[PDB]
Chains A and B, each alone.
Chain A
Amino acid sequence: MQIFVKTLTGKTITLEVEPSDTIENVKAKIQDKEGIPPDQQRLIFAGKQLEDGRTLSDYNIQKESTLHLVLRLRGX
């Protein structure tokens, strides 16, 4: 299924996922598309920070729904 990942600027990325995909898989897919290392990604759904061990189905995330992406700055 298709989901969307958006930054708080509205910048949008589209991923092909399965409901059973883990949040860590989702971050690897984001790294595959945009080059952001997973350690810098924080994913949020409806204001809740998503945990690497959980799956999209664990958060009832539906086809065509949107996750929000914010960035951890390590440099102061």
Chain B
Amino acid sequence: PMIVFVRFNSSHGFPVEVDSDTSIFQLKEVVAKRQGVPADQLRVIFAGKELRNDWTVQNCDLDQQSIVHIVQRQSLTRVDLSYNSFYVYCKGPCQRVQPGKLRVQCSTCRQATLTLTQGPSCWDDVLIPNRMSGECQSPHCPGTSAEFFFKCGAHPTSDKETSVALHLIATNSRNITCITCTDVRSPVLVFQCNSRHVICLDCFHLYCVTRLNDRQFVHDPQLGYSLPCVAGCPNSLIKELHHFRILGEEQYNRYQQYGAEECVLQMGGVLCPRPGCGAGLLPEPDCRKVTCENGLGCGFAFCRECKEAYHEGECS
């Protein structure tokens, strides 16, 4: 036996115990009795698809305590974008990289009632907004645009309990050796250089930690603060910066802080030199007098060039 959560026309999810071999029609019957409606007017929507009455729960790839939407009047469970599953960063309760689930909602009413016209065939289809289309089966919604989302697969997750997809991470099903340690591990991160160099998560973490602490991350105005392929290949900066979640919580926050500092500096700004401040400031380019100014700054007025208290004339 297993439990399936049912959201009945956007209602709060109630559990239904089923068997692996329970048919969708049987599930429609019990929900029908509970809601006082005829079963023939029910439609079951899951993972971007309407489930047919003759399918069984296990045939529909319904995991334990997942959620189906029921409305009135290729499955995303089997998609492979490139076991070879997807991975997310689960911020809680796992606080780690975990195998993920690909799901989809209506981009206009934000409910998982949109059925896809076609399934996604590449990461771009699920990562680029509005790339895929469908019909929101909600009674009063004219939504036609799909909004994909990801959930951690290591425990049950509510409908809005989403996690960021780390689309460079792949199951190492073919035992590719790590470019840096030469060992075989799973999963691995695949850089988007021409060579598609593969690195294990142990070495990727150490790569990130050592480069962060040495201020060797790279600032790119279009992408942010990132790192390229460990082998130095060109045009290989990581674009989805949540991959640096592999740093762990403390170092990830230090990464975000350093990245913002570097962003200020690249925009031609200055970091306030007063001890205990360090506020990021963007004065006029021609301006030598910089004042760290309702509750954000420390009030220090300093010379942009020598970083001492503002002074007339040449520095020193």
Contact = CB atoms under 8 A, between A and B. Distances in A.
Given A35-B294, A64-B91, A71-B296, A47 B278 contact: no
A49 B261 CA distance: 11
Given A58-B129, A75-B291, A47 B280 contact: no
Interface string A45-58: 11111000000011
Interface string B224-257: 1110000000000000111010000000010111
A63 B258 CA distance: 21
Contacts, number: 117
Interface string B277-316: 1111111100100110111111000000000000000000
Contacts of A70: 260, 263-264, 269, 279-282
Interface residues of A, number: 30
A29 interface: no
Contact of B294 (A34, A60, A66): A34
A11 B279 CA distance: 9
B263 A48 contact: yes
B223 interface: yes
B206 interface: no
Contacts of A66: 253, 256
A71 B259 contact: no
B256 A8 contact: no
A18 to B, nearest CB: 9
B295 A34 contact: yes
B296 A7 contact: yes
Q: Specify which of A36, A44, A63 lies most central, judged by the most chain B CB atoms within 10 Å of its CB.
A: A44
Contact of A48 (B223, B277, B283, B284): B223
Of B110, B240, B241, B244, the most chain A CB neighbours within 10 A belong to B241
Contact of A49 (B129, B267, B291): B267
A63 B90 CA distance: 11
A42 B221 CA distance: 14
A9 B225 contact: no
Contacts of B217: 47
A17 B287 CA distance: 36
Given A68-B257, A70-B269, A70-B282, A47 B297 contact: no
A66 B163 CA distance: 15
Given A47-B219, A47-B262, A71-B297, A42 B279 contact: no
B276 A9 contact: yes
A69 to B, nearest CB: 8
Given A62-B163, A70-B260, 5 more contacts: A11-B296, A47-B224, A68-B263, A73-B284, A75-B283
26 contacts: A7-B280, A8-B257, A8-B271, A35-B294, A42-B267, A42-B282, A44-B260, A45-B224, A46-B241, A46-B255, A46-B256, A47-B241, A47-B258, A48-B222, A48-B224, A60-B164, A60-B240, A60-B242, A62-B91, A62-B163, A68-B256, A69-B280, A71-B282, A71-B297, A73-B282, A73-B287
Interface of A: 7-9, 11, 20, 34-36, 42, 44-49, 57-58, 60, 62-64, 66, 68-75
